[PDB]
Write a protein that binds this ligand. Structure first.
Ligand SMILES: Nc1ncnc2c1ncn2[C@@H]1O[C@H](COP(=O)(O)OP(=O)(O)NP(=O)(O)O)[C@@H](O)[C@H]1O
Ligand SMILES: Nc1ncnc2c1ncn2[C@@H]1O[C@H](COP(=O)(O)OP(=O)(O)NP(=O)(O)O)[C@@H](O)[C@H]1O
Ligand SMILES: CCCc1cc(=O)oc2c(C(=O)N3CCCc4ccccc43)c(OC)cc(OC)c12
Ligand SMILES: CCCc1cc(=O)oc2c(C(=O)N3CCCc4ccccc43)c(OC)cc(OC)c12
Ligand SMILES: [Cl-]
Ligand SMILES: [Cl-]
Ligand SMILES: [Mg+2]
Ligand SMILES: [Mg+2]
Lengths: 385, 385
């Protein structure tokens, strides 16, 4: 047992491949109940088996595409294609492309820099209060590292050029940089082959495809003025309200009545829905289109208002906060300035509300409509005993 | 508005100081209810205001000290000093010190290598199934980076030497290395002054000191055959059960009765306690002496057995799992082989039970003592309504 074998130093790439968990999530198979979109039945809540890391390297490129809408408000469309046979995933989007020019500081072209070098980002200047999802300068490079082949193509009409380059073998080598004269509609397309040996999978199977499809529906439902192609098929989502309705299409509660939905778009950065939950406290939230599956201070900031109001109400007619919360199923779509998270996977948004860059005070009509639901009634019937 | 201002690349240290959240947690103030050890109140649950990152850089060194017990069973003592007036924290441990010799590969001495270079660890060979908390090779360098002064002292009798060296200015520079002849009992002492400017703090105030002291009590409760000193005073903790008694002593439920405590040390790697909860589902768990404050699959693995058995018991009489779970307050102390987590802060342990390296099937005696709790009675009083 020599010292040189015991104590080792790893490069950034070696550490990412050796310890992928804090970067992309688990690289082992997980079986858990998730919301998916199947070909025949659409949105459904079913138990799925999948590798979180593969799903996450898909989510990174998708959220980058969504952030380009914040970068260029004239962007209108995303196009996602998933071909399991050839193991090929493409994410394309319109709007301003990446500047095709040499970086005077790092001495390489900008797409090569921000797709083949770790810790590269346009979000490192926090004096700019951005509502994009990207924060750390990892996601695209992480998807590159966990792919066998990874091609980036982007066209800039301002620079009148088009860039295309390919990385291979877990970002261990790069192909030929192809530059061509360009003068048409700006676009960005990322096409990658997931390294299924890193995830111990044979091919892109059904569960992972359904999860990716539901993620495309999420992007269609959380962004503004964006249509989403999926294998050339548009996603019929017109607003966060219709997206939320996709989850509760005439689904009844345990007594037989249709679930009552209380909805309000508070402002240009917050849209909230609330309904009854049988499975305890549920939340489906988005921060800058990022699916925050663990929630965060935005969800707390929205839900604690309802909780305090209902607690005061039930105190009038005579209680714990968690009892009120466990009957709530809340949907939040929020745009937060320079959000912080627990990890690269960004499942828990930890930014304090004072730094949100916006507010989300619920209207008195929304609050009164929340009083009308059977939450207060059930809790008041509880407190009697 | 130029390209080189927009698209930027950061070094590892630069990125850590610029984006500390995924490395150490938030560097902003947090106000939330925590368990702390207040002088003359002992352990108590109260609101505290603190910076998570400061707490975490303390926790990293404390956990490393605990890990040395797994490295060397002959180790017997950890000594913690907190001097708020001089902004000094010192963590000393006995057992085998770090080898004081030049690392032939990295061409420098081993302590300097593993405390002044990022991505350096003895835990990178997962063919070795270890139950240490160290996994990534960051923690000690993270404490170094967020300290104005960070001194490592370690003695190796095997190499007949003693190493001492100090880094300053956020691991920006290092002082002179001291190598002295040594032929005594090995030890390792880490002494640092946290860079409180990075945390917008002026001194180690009451709340952060109480949190650090409660963490020392955590270590005294979660480790085996290790004495824990705090400022030279012995912590009167004799096992996980007495540690839990520090939480559940003289506690009463809202009706006026004492709480039923169901305890079992399943094996040398698992110890569990269970009681009632008036605040919803509560858990206090440790993995390899790391406080997993968000829980994880070890907590789920222990709690789902209780939940399913109580569910069967309630189904016998003429209920959902979360309803049973919300009445539970569980304590879990576990040793997990090569655990994985969502982030460097290791608050959520994500390793699947099948990879734990050990099992924890609760005894029929424990299950029967659990069905006799007020959980089943409260659930059936709810069903009667
Ligand atoms: N579809 C896209 N359209 C335009 N710019 C893009 C697109 N995808 C990526 N980029 C740019 O490429 C950069 C690198 O992306 P990425 O590696 O994901 O880092 P990031 O998004 O800034 N932060 P993070 O995702 O948290 O690591 C981004 O910051 C964007 O400036
Ligand atoms: N008190 C100690 N006694 C002996 N060896 C130690 C001690 N503290 C640290 N080390 C060694 O120094 C290495 C660096 O520690 P650290 O940077 O915390 O990484 P790590 O503990 O291995 N993994 P992590 O803490 O999760 O980032 C450890 O892996 C140990 O081999
Ligand atoms: C491990 C992958 C993380 C994850 C990723 C994802 O994309 O979705 C998730 C959903 C999930 O399907 N939804 C619907 C869309 C977005 C969303 C936002 C917040 C909460 C849940 C959901 C989910 O529902 C139990 C649970 C999840 O993690 C346990 C994940
Ligand atoms: C960012 C700090 C993370 C954190 C760190 C810590 O050390 O403790 C915590 C406790 C806490 O006091 N305890 C008691 C001992 C250890 C423990 C283990 C698991 C769960 C809770 C606890 C806690 O109690 C709600 C809540 C916590 O975070 C929300 C934290
Ligand atoms: Cl997160
Ligand atoms: Cl974590
Ligand atoms: Mg990104
Ligand atoms: Mg460590």
């Amino acid at each position: 047992a020599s010292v040189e074998r015991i104590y080792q130093k790893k490069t950034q790439l070696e550490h990412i491949l050796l310890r992928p968990d804090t970067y992309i999530g688990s690289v082992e198979l997980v079986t858990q109940q998730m919301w998916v979109y199947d070909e025949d039945v659409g949105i459904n809540y079913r138990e799925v088996t999948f590798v979180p890391g593969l799903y996450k390297i898909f989510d990174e490129i998708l959220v980058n595409a969504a952030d380009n809408k914040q970068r260029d408000p004239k962007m209108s469309c995303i196009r996602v294609t998933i071909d399991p046979e050839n193991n090929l995933i493409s994410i394309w989007n319109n709007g301003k492309g990446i500047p095709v020019v040499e970086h005077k500081v790092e001495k390489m072209y900008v797409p090569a820099l921000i797709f083949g070098q770790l810790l590269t980002s346009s979000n490192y200047d926090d004096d700019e209060k951005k509502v994009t999802g990207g924060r750390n300068g990892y996601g695209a490079k992480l998807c590159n590292i966990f792919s066998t082949k990874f091609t980036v193509e982007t066209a800039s009409r301002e620079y009148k050029k088009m860039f295309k380059q390919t990385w291979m073998d877990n970002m261990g080598r790069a192909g030929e940089m192809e530059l061509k004269p360009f003068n048409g509609e700006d676009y960005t397309c990322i096409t990658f082959q997931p390294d299924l040996s890193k995830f111990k999978m044979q091919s892109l199977d059904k569960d992972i495809v359904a999860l990716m499809v539901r993620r495309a529906y999420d992007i269609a439902g959380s962004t503004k003025d964006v249509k989403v192609f999926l294998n050339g098929n548009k996603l019929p989502v017109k607003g966060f309200r219709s997206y939320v309705d996709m989850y509760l299409k005439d689904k009844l509660d345990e007594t037989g009545n249709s679930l009552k939905v209380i909805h309000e778009q508070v402002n240009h950065r917050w849209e909230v829905c609330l309904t009854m939950s049988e499975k305890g406290f549920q939340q489906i939230s988005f921060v800058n289109s990022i699916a925050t599956s663990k929630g965060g201070r935005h969800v707390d900031y929205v839900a604690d208002q309802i909780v305090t109001k209902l607690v005061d109400v039930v105190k009038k007619k005579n209680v714990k906060a968690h009892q009120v919360k466990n009957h709530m199923w809340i949907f939040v779509n929020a745009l937060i300035e320079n959000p912080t998270f627990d990890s690269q996977t960004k499942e828990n948004m930890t930014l304090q509300p004072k730094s949100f860059g916006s507010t989300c005070q619920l209207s008195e009509k929304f609050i009164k409509a929340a009083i009308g639901c059977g939450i207060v009634e059930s809790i008041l019937n509880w407190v009697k005993f």
